[PDB]
Structure 1
Amino acid sequence: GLTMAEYFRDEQGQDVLLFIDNIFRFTQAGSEVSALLGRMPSAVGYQPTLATEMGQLQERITSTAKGSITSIQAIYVPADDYTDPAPATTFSHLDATTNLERKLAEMGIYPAVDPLASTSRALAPEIVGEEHYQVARKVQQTLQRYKELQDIIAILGMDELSDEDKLVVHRARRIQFFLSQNFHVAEQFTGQPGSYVPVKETVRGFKEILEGKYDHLPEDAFRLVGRIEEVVEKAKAMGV
């Protein structure tokens, strides 16, 4: 796939997208053939040359002065263990990463994306603007505070805690459900047709949740929706 995409980048000069599906299966194949080639084993039953092969493939996938390859890849985390060698080595070669968690998928929050572990080099004030960055980091404080507070709630109980601690749990529930969205490929999986939210709208809405304007609405209306306008109507059907 890469030699075709390289010819279009270099000689024709048009800009290009590359989609590679499950690049872990490249790393996994080497292991199978390593023992029969005569190589001694390393770490968790892996080839002695893991970082090399990943480097040779990955360092070809670049945007040169001639033309640009935007590259999107799926990686499978070998045994639900992000501390495994194949994902760890891969993490060094990316500009943006989204990590998917089964705990969120069990709660039904789709797409199931970790808002803390997913980071990109472009969340800098200059490359996205001061208003965008302010809202983004402030959401990340709310969700990290909810994580530590869940331990205290699970053993001692929610009523035991302060008004500021209560208001964090209030907002964090809404923020986490409002990160879920109705996709077109979720038409087959969920009945409802689907939505596209422009960036300006996303910033307005998340700012309202943080400032408390929409806190009167019941939490169940923030699941699998696109724009904040829709959330107001969905609540009306419930009767609020």
Structure 2
Amino acid sequence: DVKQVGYVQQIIGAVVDVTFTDSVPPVLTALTVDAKETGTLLTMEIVQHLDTKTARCICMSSTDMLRLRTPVVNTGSQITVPVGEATLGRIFNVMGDAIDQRGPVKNKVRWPIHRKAPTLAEQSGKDEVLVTGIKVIDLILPYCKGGKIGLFGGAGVGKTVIIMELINNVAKGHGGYSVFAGVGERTREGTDLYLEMMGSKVIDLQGDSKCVLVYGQMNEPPGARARVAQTALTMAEYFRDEAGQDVLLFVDNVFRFTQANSEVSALLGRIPAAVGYQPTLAEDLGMLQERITSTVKGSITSVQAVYVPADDITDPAPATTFSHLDATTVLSRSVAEAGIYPAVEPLECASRIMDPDAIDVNHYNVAMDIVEMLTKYKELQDIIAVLGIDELSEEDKLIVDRARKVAKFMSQPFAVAEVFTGMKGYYVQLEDCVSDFGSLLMGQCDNIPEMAFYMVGGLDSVKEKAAKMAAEAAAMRERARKAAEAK
């Protein structure tokens, strides 16, 4: 049958208006304009209607060389993207167009990106811990298989490195299809990641692959960043529903999805919120989040990163995003300045699975104490920085000497940051983390110095570091002795 055709009305940045004479399509319908006029293909989804015979819309690719009276073709459907095993080991754009230059993807069906969330009947919150190998993540804020995870932190705190370390520990040790959505981040990171995966045969092209990559990065206009995570979720939901298989959804990061809608709502004429974000922040974020839910058919263990401008948690976007998460990971910058990486602030962090019913009892009674001690150490930082260590009771400076040990022990080297720290990466098991913190908590190791806990994993490595420190101290004593005798 005929495809409806319309004409442009006005253009403001990525935003466009369209006049469909006979009638208007529904919301979210796609509008293609030929590559003849603009020079390249261009899809434009409708978001709202101004009056009848009219429709305002957002453009995916650039609006350059676009005129006021161009023809606009209606697809008769939403933005459709392919799904299946052909999407494995391939890179895709927001529209499902591939960019890896490998070959034509052998899709069979195409699903839309905009979709209503699952119903309450389908949901199933099952509590199963997720052994990352990371120490603080295991202890304080244990992740939950099938839930959501959040890595909150400013620029230059170590969350993209947390994601690479989680890939190296969990993804390859998963046996389930993964999806990686780059939403307004460095193109360089996506290149390093496609190479790190093409080296480990996870994207083995001539055989079986177990990963998918979507990348609408900062170079793209906000029309793409505002609709990329939807496409990645479509690739994940196909595996969740049809295949009924556990998957992962690594997202880096949703704050640029929020910036995209913020840069859009201004142009659409919507009056903005307090700081300047869109008024539809909670809804636009919820329709993204609530699609990530663990049903009976499958399960989605998402790992989302979030940006915090000016290291400001009162920003409405992260402040809204805390509510949607099962396990928060609040990073800080003052901690990274102290040499610790990962720069976690466990007093701010939280989780849902942290109950005796889900995790074992020792892990819980240990973490509850660990949080408590650091809570006291924070109260004493206001005084020690004023007076000093010597002006405290023996109980207080003990608790300080123990909490400095704990906080230093919370650090560890990752295999990804070997370039930075120059140390081999450790994989701290869950059981040895709790046995170490419980021993450190009951004073089982108090004679050990402070620095032996820095950037290490496992108490055996601590006591070998203490042995090296004592050996070097004695060696400098013999050396100062001989230097004095010869002098």
Same fold (TM over 0.5): yes
Structure 1 partner of 2:256: 25
Structure 1 partner of 2:480: none
Superposed CA offset, 1:99-146 (max 9, x none): 100010000111111111111111111211222111111111110000
1:1-240, aligned counterparts within 5 Å? Answer: 1-239=232-470
Q: Distance in 1 between matches of 2:388 and 2:423?
A: 36
RMSD over aligned CA atoms reads 1.1
Superposed CA offset, 1:148-196 (max 9, x none): 1111112223212211111111101100000001110011211111111
Q: Report the structure, 1 or 2, having the larger helix content.
A: 1
Q: Report the structure, 1 or 2, having the larger strand content.
A: 2
Q: Distance in 1 between matches of 2:454 and 2:406?
A: 10
Structure 1 residue 88: deviation in Å? 0.7
Q: Distance in 1 between matches of 2:242 and 2:362?
A: 41
Structure 1 residue 72: deviation in Å? 0.6
Q: TM-score, normalised by structure 2?
A: 0.48
Q: Distance in 2 between matches of 1:13 and 1:180?
A: 37
Between 1:7-16 and 1:100-109, the stretch displaced more is 7-16
Amino acid at match of 2:469: M
Q: TM-score, normalised by structure 1?
A: 0.97
**Partner secondary structure for residue 311 of structure 2:** coil
Between 1:42-51 and 1:155-164, the stretch displaced more is 155-164
For structure 1, list consecutive stretches of 5 or more residues without a partner in the other structure: none
**Partner secondary structure for residue 127 of structure 1:** coil
Amino acid at match of 1:122: I
Contact 2:413 2:455 in 1 (8 A): yes
**Partner secondary structure for residue 125 of structure 1:** coil
Q: Distance in 1 between matches of 2:411 and 2:446?
A: 18
Superposed CA offset, 1:191-226 (max 9, x none): 111111111110111111112222112211111101
**Partner secondary structure for residue 242 of structure 2:** helix
Structure 1 residue 79: deviation in Å? 2.1
Q: Distance in 1 between matches of 2:374 and 2:238?
A: 45
**Partner secondary structure for residue 382 of structure 2:** helix
Between the two proteins, what is the percent identity of the paired residues? 65
**Partner secondary structure for residue 463 of structure 2:** helix
Q: Distance in 2 between matches of 1:23 and 1:169?
A: 38
**Rg larger for:** 2
**Partner secondary structure for residue 248 of structure 2:** strand
Q: Distance in 1 between matches of 2:364 and 2:318?
A: 28
Aligned length: 240
